[PDB]
Design a binder for this molecule. Structure first.
Ligand SMILES: COC1=C(OC)C(=O)C(C/C=C(\C)CC/C=C(\C)CC/C=C(\C)CC/C=C(\C)CC/C=C(\C)CC/C=C(\C)CC/C=C(/C)CC/C=C(\C)CC/C=C(\C)CCC=C(C)C)=C(C)C1=O
Ligand SMILES: COC[C@@H](CCO[C@H]1CC[C@@]2(C)C(=CC[C@H]3[C@@H]4C[C@@H]5O[C@]6(CC[C@@H](C)CO6)[C@@H](C)[C@@H]5[C@@]4(C)CC[C@@H]32)C1)CO[C@@H]1O[C@H](CO)[C@@H](O[C@H]2O[C@H](CO)[C@@H](O)[C@H](O)[C@H]2O)[C@H](O)[C@H]1O
Ligand code: HEC
Ligand code: HEC
Ligand code: HEC
Ligand code: HEC
Ligand code: HEM
Ligand code: HEM
Ligand code: HEM
Ligand code: FES
Lengths: 403, 16, 232, 181, 144, 135, 204, 16
């Protein structure tokens, strides 16, 4: 209503925010498949929050009842199995969407100036997401849950001096137990969700401060019409809102297909050994991380030394933070970067996929050799970026976006 | 039909 | 090497026979404590009174979980390994693994219970289905001849052409109630019931997912039209 | 393995108490017919070595060699245990205890280690129970409960199990087992 | 745990931290044979295993008479079977007493030191224990 | 730092937000005792969130263990008694401070125009607080 | 009803030890203290762990175990007509004065199932379990002479020590709380002066 | 001192 909105606008900047962030907010008109994943990440975060709130209505964060409570959700709670599968598939889809989001950032140089803070907030979001998923995977209290938590927290025992004390303090016990379960449940259900929501708010605010990149890397703000609107810019609402609605429907089709027909996804979204209750005295023949942690695992497994392996695994994630300063290309988009940048992006993607694929299996000779090679390539993609971004010859970026 | 399908394995012989 | 089994979760009779087998030969050591008798009866089509009379041996109520008197610690002490809860064993191991495991027990005097398992070597489980299967041994029997996947059947009778192999699971004749096919069907029904127990929402999941996907296709048509239009 | 054909001849002395085919007529003597050969051999060795005390068998197995015991065990395992009759007033409680055990007290059902039909597991050494005399079964359960019989091994399977059975439970379950087949 | 009542060549099972601890009263011939078993162990000096800094590297116990080993097989955490017999028919003729894992056939000597080429990659753990008195030990507090 | 803040401000609304909300935001200079309670309500909300997060690490939301888990917090968790007392006294102080805040609004007509939305959001906060405290 | 005031001293280790002895011997037969551990009771009362295990742990439990009892609540509710509540927090549920008056107010009432009634807790399902010590108390409450081990003063001390232990059991953090609170308040008074001065400086 | 203060109420006579 006109009068109601006039009353609100005098007392709340509703119309002002709407015209500053969604309408009258002109994003590049050449977004492609790779720009669906921010909105899909928001959708998956909302799905995780809702389904987690509902699982918490029935979950028991105790070592004696966690697994039994999960089965109670799966069988006794009306549609509880739907909510649980939504949550597990939503964690896996959160990591799928976020990895594709980060790979878009890599492809189109979206981390470069002025979006360095956007990239840093996104990486903080990624760290929070990894912590959240790790602590959630302990909640079912299956064999995989318990033993993956055991190994991951023993990693903190690799710190030379304070490692063992730090690991014990994190566990809250001399081993992984119900104390660790309840603690990780509290962190996973409130603390990290709050941190993630705040980080997402900061991320979107920084983006809207500096504006979106585009597949061509063209700074659309340079060319503006008489009204001040970029020539290659269109209002986010309604054009990209409807585009993101279509993307959300497609994502929901895939998401519901997985939920209702293949919730386990061949044992990758719901690992088979995790359907057995945690046993402190019998460890699985082969213990592997959830798929979305597998690459870094491979890196850690590729290093013969324990402390060096932990340091390398941490650096594999920390280097993405400095990525904005590693890239010295005069152009943003891979479309106009030299052959070296394209080759190294291909190498990095292949190495990441191979690291994930070989970290999901028991160690093998070819697997170990390829994991070490891919660790070298993964770190070289970043370490050599400041050099091969300068050595290459880049194409001239068009004044107007293509399409 | 179901009852025959579900008959317990153990059969006990009782006096009378 | 596992053996494939085609498990039909819509077969109420097979699931009922599997539930009977589980209640009689299995719940002595194994619990199904994440699963209630009431839900099992509802999904298998067993009347509640019939479920109470025929499958509930522990004095539990219809709505009670399929708990057993054997405690995990006691059974671990007695057998050397705790008999795991079998509600989700179909998901933990898969139906093919269970089908091959329950048919792979063979006499092995070197073992604590006189038996070993091809699928689960040095398993701590006694061969509790020996009365049905009969004495199974690692002996010499006729196996279909295969040469690089060149599998020979009899063109006329349609039965396999066989040669003797001396490292095969052979059931000693006239040692069990059921022949090979009858024990195969018994194990198939048991594994079908276990598959239902692991995933009791499978059929409803498929139905609901079909309807959800139909709705999402409809909504996609509308959203795609609202997008491509309004992008002109 | 033992030879049933020779065990028959070697088992004639035993048939005085256990019956010619191992189906004892007197309740206090256990039926050896159809009992697991492994279990029979273990019991005979235990009685020889004093691990199980049967006063009625004092010196009866000392002169029998290992092969003679194996032959006798094979002969008795080659027979069929006759099935008795359960007391109607006790069959319900005994059946409930045998098939279900006690969830609250944590007592296992007997149908796991001993088959639902009470035939035991011959390879595992779990004795055949169905058809066994109610008096003998009750005596063995009482002996396990009181620790009189301890040849069930260090794991104390049956000592622990019988610790959870009352006298009424023992009588009812023995009566049920007498008619179990 | 009161350990002065363990007759030569027998062990008791204590329960510490959820885990089973075998406390074995190791006789003479056993400790005479153990120095002759170094040719079949993957970690005879317990370089990579887990044990306190005050136990002997070879015997892996505070004193040779007593052997306190957490009875959890390194490979998949199964409880090894105690086999003090000299040459069991199914352990082979080279056996000199020790621990035989039944699940996957992992072997350890009486000092808990794993044999070579077995599923168990490390020796059996030595828990942190001490001698309060000649007949009693405490499993859980380090020796002073 | 000057250079660091220049870098941030070109990429984040840091200084602009600081100077729109906290600095260069000119409030009446005659705030009295009754205007302490918005900041105190914020502090009590932060305390409730933090103490409740730490209580959730040891609480068991089951009828069998809820009371036992609370006593576990009081007795077995190091300083868990402190955290639980902070939480309960913080709920009581939250309602004390919120009631004094609402009474300030009543006294000085802070609900009147143009602050009707402020008052309505405050009442929604009060409803959420009632539900939160009850649960 | 009118209660008798008792001055409970939670620093009296000897009194709390006597109360713990009385609770373990006369009260843990039907009442659990399942929310506190033997180890913490020993630590707070100054009782050595070995002495605590020998003298106060009768259930075979470990020092670190909760002070549980064999009498299950359902069985006790059936037997007595009311479940003996866990007494760990009873000093907070009822208060020390109420407990002191209640444990001394049992008198003989043949109309009751257990032959006793209580002035503080009329028609209570508790049997008078301290009758051997107090003696035969009858109705104003008077103790029949030469019927109990202890006189009125000696029994009051026994109840006072027991109530003191119950008072500690309900609030084991009270002494540590008053110690920590003193420093927290001292710091806040210290911090207030700096905050007050800082505010005064700026508001010139 | 503490040992006497904590002496169990129940005293048992034992042979020898
Ligand atoms: C097989 O195996 C393996 C796998 O697995 C299967 C794997 O996957 C992997 C691969 C691993 C991965 C890639 C997974 C990665 C997963 C992770 C990153 C998970 C890591 C998560 C953890 C282990 C959690 C660790 C958590 C830590 C260390 C952080 C701890 C944080 C705290 C405890 C917070 C501290 C609390 C505080 C400070 C309280 C707040 C204090 C206050 C002051 C509050 C405010 C108080 C007041 C206001 C009062 C005082 C008043 C003041 C200040 C005065 C002034 C007043 C004002 C208010 C102004 C590997 C290698 C592996 O091999
Ligand atoms: C044997 O075959 C080797 C094959 C290579 C590999 C996997 C091996 C040992 C250390 C590995 C490095 C540790 C550093 O870690 C990283 C991250 C940590 C940094 C501090 C140093 O650099 C690597 C770039 C560096 C690193 C991850 C790259 C690859 C190294 C094994
Ligand atoms: C119906 C007759 C039964 C089926 C089907 C299964 N069991 Fe058992 N079982 C028993 C023990 C002591 C174990 C543990 C052995 C070890 O860990 O080495 C098992 C194990 C299984 C497994 C393996 C599950 C896994 O995740 O590895 C399956 C699939 C299984 N059992 C199915 C003991 C007994 C027992 C006591 C006599 C009975 C009656 C049964 N099992 C019956 C069945
Ligand atoms: C009467 C003089 C007996 C003769 C002759 C034999 N046995 Fe017997 N045996 C007898 C009794 C009274 C009992 C029961 C003991 C008890 O505890 O109640 C037994 C028991 C056995 C058993 C154990 C059976 C079981 O546990 O199921 C065995 C295996 C057995 N006896 C074997 C056996 C053999 C081989 C004999 C001839 C060499 C023999 N028995 C003779 C009494 C008598
Ligand atoms: C079994 C013989 C008991 C022993 C020994 C003791 N108590 Fe008891 N108690 C018992 C019952 C059955 C009840 C319930 C009575 C009812 O009508 O509800 C109680 C109750 C108490 C209470 C009341 C607590 C409350 O109402 O919140 C107290 C304070 C109490 N008991 C204390 C107490 C003490 C100090 C004891 C040792 C001296 C003691 N009880 C022993 C049963 C039994
Ligand atoms: C698990 C293994 C069990 C189960 C759950 C029960 N029993 Fe049975 N039992 C078991 C073993 C290993 C043995 C052999 C003991 C030995 O070697 O000395 C037995 C033996 C018996 C016997 C004695 C049979 C005889 O003497 O002929 C009886 C009477 C018996 N067991 C009874 C019994 C009952 C009533 C059970 C349920 C309450 C039961 N058993 C369970 C192993 C196991
Ligand atoms: C980024 C957001 C989140 C991610 C990535 C995530 C991830 C996960 C994962 C991977 C599991 C393991 C599921 C399984 O394998 O069974 C899990 C479990 C769980 N999560 Fe989270 N979660 C998120 C947010 C939340 C929130 C906000 C809540 C509650 C408010 C929550 C509550 C739970 C509960 C109760 C469980 C245990 C039940 C179960 O395992 O299904 N989660 N989570
Ligand atoms: C996990 C939850 C996340 C959410 C909800 C989220 C949300 C969004 C949204 C809505 C956008 C705008 C639309 C789009 O560009 O797709 C965006 C852009 C962006 N995101 Fe994310 N994001 C998340 C995580 C991440 C992560 C992990 C990274 C990188 C490490 C990241 C980096 C970026 C960058 C650089 C941009 C702007 C680049 C450009 O304009 O092309 N984000 N984010
Ligand atoms: C406005 C915010 C909140 C208010 C007013 C509030 C109020 C309360 C109150 C009155 C209790 C009862 C405590 C007692 O009587 O012992 C309670 C219990 C509890 N609260 Fe909240 N709460 C708030 C936020 C939270 C949050 C955010 C969490 C978790 C992140 C939380 C976790 C808990 C837990 C675990 C308990 C049970 C343990 C206990 O009783 O101490 N609370 N809350
Ligand atoms: S369980 Fe010990 S070798 Fe595998």
């Amino acid at each position: 209503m006109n009068k109601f909105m006039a009353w609100v606008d005098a007392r709340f900047p509703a119309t002002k925010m709407w015209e500053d962030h969604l309408s009258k907010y002109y994003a590049p008109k050449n977004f492609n498949f790779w720009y669906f994943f921010g909105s899909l990440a928001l959708l998956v975060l909302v799905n995780q929050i809702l389904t987690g709130i509902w699982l918490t209505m029935s979950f028991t964060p105790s070592a004696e009842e966690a697994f039994a409570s999960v089965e109670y959700i799966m069988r006794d709670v009306d549609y509880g199995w739907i909510i649980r599968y939504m949550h597990s598939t939503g964690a896996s889809a959160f990591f799928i969407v976020v990895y594709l989001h980060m790979f878009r950032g890599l492809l189109y140089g979206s981390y470069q100036k002025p979006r360095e803070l956007v990239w840093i907030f996104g990486m903080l979001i990624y760290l929070a997401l990894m912590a959240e998923a790790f602590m959630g995977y302990l909640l079912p209290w299956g064999q995989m849950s318990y033993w993956g938590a055991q190994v991951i927290i023993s990693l903190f025992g690799a710190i030379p001096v304070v490692g063992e004390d730090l690991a014990q303090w994190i566990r809250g016990d001399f081993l992984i137990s119900g104390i660790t379960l309840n603690r990780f449940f509290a962190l996973h259900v409130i603390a990290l969700p709050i941190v993630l929501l705040g980080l997402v708010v900061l991320h979107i605010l920084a983006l809207h401060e500096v504006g979106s990149n585009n597949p061509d890397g063209v700074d659309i703000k340079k060319k503006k019409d008489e009204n001040g609107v970029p020539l290659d810019g269109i209002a986010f609402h309604p054009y990209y809102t409807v585009k993101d609605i279509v993307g959300v429907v497609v994502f929901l089709f895939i998401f519901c297909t997985v939920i209702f027909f293949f919730p386990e996804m061949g044992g990758y979204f719901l690992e088979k050994p995790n359907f057995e209750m945690a046993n402190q005295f019998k460890t699985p023949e082969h213990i592997a991380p959830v798929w979305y942690f597998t690459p870094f695992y491979a890196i850690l497994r590729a290093v013969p030394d324990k402390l060096m392996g932990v340091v390398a695994m941490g650096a594999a994630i920390a280097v993405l933070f400095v990525l904005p300063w590693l890239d010295r290309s005069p152009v943003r988009s891979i479309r106009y970067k030299g052959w070296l940048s394209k080759l190294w992006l291909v190498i990095f993607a292949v190495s990441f996929v191979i690291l994930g694929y070989y970290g999901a299996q028991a160690p093998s000779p070819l697997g170990t050799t390829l994991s070490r090679v891919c660790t070298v390539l993964y770190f070289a993609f970043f370490i050599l970026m400041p050099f091969y971004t300068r050595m290459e010859k880049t194409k001239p970026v068009p004044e107007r976006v293509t399409g | 039909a179901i009852a025959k399908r579900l008959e317990p394995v153990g059969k006990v012989c009782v006096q009378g | 090497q596992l053996d494939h089994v085609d498990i039909d979760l819509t077969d109420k009779a097979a699931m009922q026979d599997g539930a009977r087998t589980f209640a009689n030969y299995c719940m002595g050591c194994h619990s199904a404590k994440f699963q209630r008798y009431e839900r099992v009866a509802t999904d298998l089509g067993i009347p509640a009174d019939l479920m109470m009379e025929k499958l509930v041996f522990t004095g539990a109520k219809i709505g009670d979980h399929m708990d057993i008197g054997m405690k995990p610690a006691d059974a671990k002490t007695w057998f050397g390994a705790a008999p795991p809860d079998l509600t989700l064993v179909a998901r933990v191991r898969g139906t093919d693994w269970l089908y091959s495991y329950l048919r792979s027990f063979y006499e092995d005097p070197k073992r604590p219970w006189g038996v070993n398992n091809v699928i689960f070597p040095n398993v701590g489980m006694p061969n509790v289905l020996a009365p049905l299967q009969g004495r199974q041994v690692i002996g010499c029997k006729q196996v279909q001849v295969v040469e690089d996947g060149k599998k020979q059947f009899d063109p006329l009778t349609g039965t396999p052409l066989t040669h003797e192999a001396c490292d095969q699971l052979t059931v000693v004749p006239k040692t069990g109630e059921l022949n090979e096919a009858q024990f195969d069907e018994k194990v198939k029904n048991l594994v079908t019931f276990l598959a239902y127990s692991a995933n009791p929402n499978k059929l409803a999941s498929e139905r609901i997912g079909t309807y959800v996907l139909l709705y999402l296709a409809f909504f996609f048509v509308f959203a795609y039209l609202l997008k491509r239009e309004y992008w002109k | 393995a033992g030879d049933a054909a020779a065990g028959q001849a070697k088992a004639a002395v035993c048939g005085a108490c256990h019956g010619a085919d191992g189906n004892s007529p007197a309740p206090n003597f256990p039926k050896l017919a159809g009992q697991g050969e492994r279990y029979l051999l273990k019991q005979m060795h235990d009685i020889k070595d004093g691990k199980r005390t049967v006063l009625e068998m004092t010196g009866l197995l000392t002169n029998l060699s290992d092969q003679d015991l194996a032959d006798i065990a094979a002969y008795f395992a080659s027979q069929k245990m006759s099935v008795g009759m359960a007391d109607p007033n006790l069959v319900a409680q005994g059946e409930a205890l045998f098939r279900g055990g006690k969830i609250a007290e944590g007592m296992p059902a007997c149908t796991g280690c001993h088959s639902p039909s009470g035939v035991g597991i011959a390879t595992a050494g779990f004795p055949h129970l169905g058809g066994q005399h109610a008096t003998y079964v009750a005596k063995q359960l009482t002996d396990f409960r009181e620790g009189t019989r301890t040849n069930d091994g260090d794991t104390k399977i049956m000592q622990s199990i019988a610790a959870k059975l009352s006298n009424k439970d023992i009588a009812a379950i023995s009566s049920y087992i007498q008619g179990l087949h | 745990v009161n350990v002065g009542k363990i007759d030569p060549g027998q062990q008791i099972i204590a329960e510490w931290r959820g885990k089973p601890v075998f406390i074995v009263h190791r006789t003479k011939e056993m400790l005479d044979a153990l120095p002759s078993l170094e040719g079949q162990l993957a970690d005879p000096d317990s370089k990579a295993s887990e044990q306190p800094e005050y136990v002997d590297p070879k015997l892996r116990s505070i004193k040779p008479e007593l052997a306190v080993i957490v009875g959890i097989c390194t490979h998949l955490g199964c409880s090894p079977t105690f086999r003090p017999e000299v040459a069991p028919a199914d352990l082979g003729p080279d056996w000199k007493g020790g621990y035989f894992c039944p699940c996957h056939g992992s072997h350890y000597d009486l000092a808990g030191r794993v044999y070579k080429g077995q599923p168990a990659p490390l020796n059996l753990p030595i828990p942190p224990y001490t001698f309060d008195a000649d007949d009693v030990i405490t499993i859980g507090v380090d020796q002073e």
